[PDB]
Amino acid sequence: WVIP
Amino acid sequence: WVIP
Amino acid sequence: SCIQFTRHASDVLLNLNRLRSRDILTDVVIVVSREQFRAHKTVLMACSGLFYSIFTDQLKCNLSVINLDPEINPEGFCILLDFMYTSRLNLREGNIMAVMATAMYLQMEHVVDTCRKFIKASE
Amino acid sequence: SCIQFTRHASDVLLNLNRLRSRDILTDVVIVVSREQFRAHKTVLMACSGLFYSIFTDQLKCNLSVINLDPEINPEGFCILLDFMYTSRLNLREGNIMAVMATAMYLQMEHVVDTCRKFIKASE
Ligand SMILES: CSc1ncc(Cl)c(Nc2ccc3c(c2)CC(=O)N3)n1
Ligand SMILES: CSc1ncc(Cl)c(Nc2ccc3c(c2)CC(=O)N3)n1
Ligand SMILES: [Cl-]
Ligand SMILES: [Cl-]
Ligand SMILES: [Cl-]
Ligand SMILES: [Cl-]
């Protein structure tokens, strides 16, 4: 999971 | 396009 | 000896979401506490262990309407349906418990994992 | 304020290909010079400008069989159908002309671009  |  | 187009999967999913937003070739209604959500059976199966099991069943594969368990929160479902078609999860303090419970029911393992981690960080 | 799962689109496409390989929920046969290819209308539309136009047509959206132009090479089609479901293109000296012609007909702009570049490098 990432900060888009 | 890339070499997978 | 194949070549690979990096953005292809993302572009496919973006187009599938465009079809969903215009209600094109949707073939099922998911009913959640009287709220209705139209979607593509194939996308639901590709994202959820529960939908995969439902639509590979010889009788259920032919149903146009699927009713979820009454404990399922419609907002939690809506957030997960948006994630299925975009890879983006709108996880907030106010919805994390409903999102995790819905993802456990839908059998969406990666969502359950991030919810567990975010909850563990708050304790 | 969403979070994003990097591998989600790739995982969705991998599952769609697994459904194709087991012939699950395929809803169309594409006929190419007597060769038959089963697929999902939504995936075809998401990858091809031609299929997008065909399955948004009020009459054609209901067809279970689509016959392509007789000039279309079945091998070229097969390579492109594999690309649609995997992001991998099996481009070879012996098939590049048939692949480019089929991709131009199918309106798959990124494939046409790489074929043009690979052909330009050989001259
Ligand atoms: C297992 S083979 C397979 N073949 C095709 C499909 Cl459409 C599919 N989907 C599916 C099954 C289980 C799970 C998911 C999707 C997401 C998750 O967390 N668990 N699986
Ligand atoms: C244009 S809006 C839109 N909405 C939904 C879909 Cl399913 C779609 N597909 C599509 C249209 C044109 C092209 C492609 C896909 C690939 C390509 O090279 N050209 N387009
Ligand atoms: Cl029904
Ligand atoms: Cl998941
Ligand atoms: Cl027909
Ligand atoms: Cl393309």
Side-chain angles (χ1 to χ4, degrees), chain A, chain B, chain C residues 1-33 35-57 59-91 93-108 110-123, chain D residues 1-33 35-57 59-91 93-108 110-123:
Chain A
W1 298 81
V2 299
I3 302 303
Chain B
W1 298 81
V2 299
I3 302 303
Chain C
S1 72
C2 287
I3 55 172
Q4 199 217 341
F5 191 68
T6 305
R7 296 295 290 159
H8 180 74
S10 185
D11 288 354
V12 164
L13 195 69
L14 188 68
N15 282 337
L16 291 175
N17 197 33
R18 282 169 177 151
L19 293 182
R20 181 177 64 122
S21 74
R22 297 170 59 209
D23 199 41
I24 300 164
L25 289 189
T26 50
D27 51 9
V28 76
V29 183
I30 307 304
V31 182
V32 190
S33 300
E35 287 254 299
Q36 295 186 14
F37 303 87
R38 297 215 46 110
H40 301 100
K41 283 173 187 184
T42 58
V43 176
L44 294 182
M45 296 169 82
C47 299
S48 155
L50 184 72
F51 290 121
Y52 171 65
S53 289
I54 296 163
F55 302 122
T56 51
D57 175 88
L59 279 176
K60 298 183 191 75
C61 67
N62 294 140
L63 297 173
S64 60
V65 179
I66 299 296
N67 307 296
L68 299 195
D69 191 284
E71 287 266 88
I72 303 308
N73 175 254
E75 188 191 29
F77 185 78
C78 184
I79 284 149
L80 290 174
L81 184 62
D82 282 342
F83 168 76
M84 293 186 194
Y85 279 89
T86 66
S87 311
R88 300 163 62 91
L89 187 72
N90 178 30
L91 203 57
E93 185 186 47
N95 70 26
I96 189 156
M97 300 311 288
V99 169
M100 188 175 143
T102 311
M104 281 170 70
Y105 170 79
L106 295 183
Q107 303 165 35
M108 300 173 68
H110 298 301
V111 174
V112 176
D113 187 63
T114 201
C115 287
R116 271 208 270 266
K117 278 167 171 67
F118 275 50
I119 287 153
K120 196 201 168 183
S122 278
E123 76 191 30
Chain D
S1 72
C2 287
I3 55 172
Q4 199 217 341
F5 191 68
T6 305
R7 296 295 290 159
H8 180 74
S10 185
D11 288 354
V12 164
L13 195 69
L14 188 68
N15 282 337
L16 291 175
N17 197 33
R18 282 169 177 151
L19 293 182
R20 181 177 64 122
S21 74
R22 297 170 59 209
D23 199 41
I24 300 164
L25 289 189
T26 50
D27 51 9
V28 76
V29 183
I30 307 304
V31 182
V32 190
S33 300
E35 287 254 299
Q36 295 186 14
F37 303 87
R38 297 215 46 110
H40 301 100
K41 283 173 187 184
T42 58
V43 176
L44 294 182
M45 296 169 82
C47 299
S48 155
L50 184 72
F51 290 121
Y52 171 65
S53 289
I54 296 163
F55 302 122
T56 51
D57 175 88
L59 278 176
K60 298 183 191 75
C61 67
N62 294 140
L63 297 173
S64 60
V65 179
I66 299 296
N67 307 296
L68 299 195
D69 191 284
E71 287 266 88
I72 303 308
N73 175 254
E75 188 191 29
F77 185 78
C78 184
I79 284 149
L80 290 174
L81 184 62
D82 282 342
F83 168 76
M84 293 186 194
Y85 279 89
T86 66
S87 311
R88 300 163 62 91
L89 187 72
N90 178 30
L91 203 57
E93 185 186 47
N95 70 26
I96 189 156
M97 300 311 288
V99 169
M100 188 175 143
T102 311
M104 281 170 70
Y105 170 78
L106 295 183
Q107 303 165 35
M108 300 173 68
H110 298 301
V111 174
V112 176
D113 187 63
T114 201
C115 287
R116 271 208 270 266
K117 278 167 171 67
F118 275 50
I119 287 153
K120 196 201 168 183
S122 278
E123 76 191 30

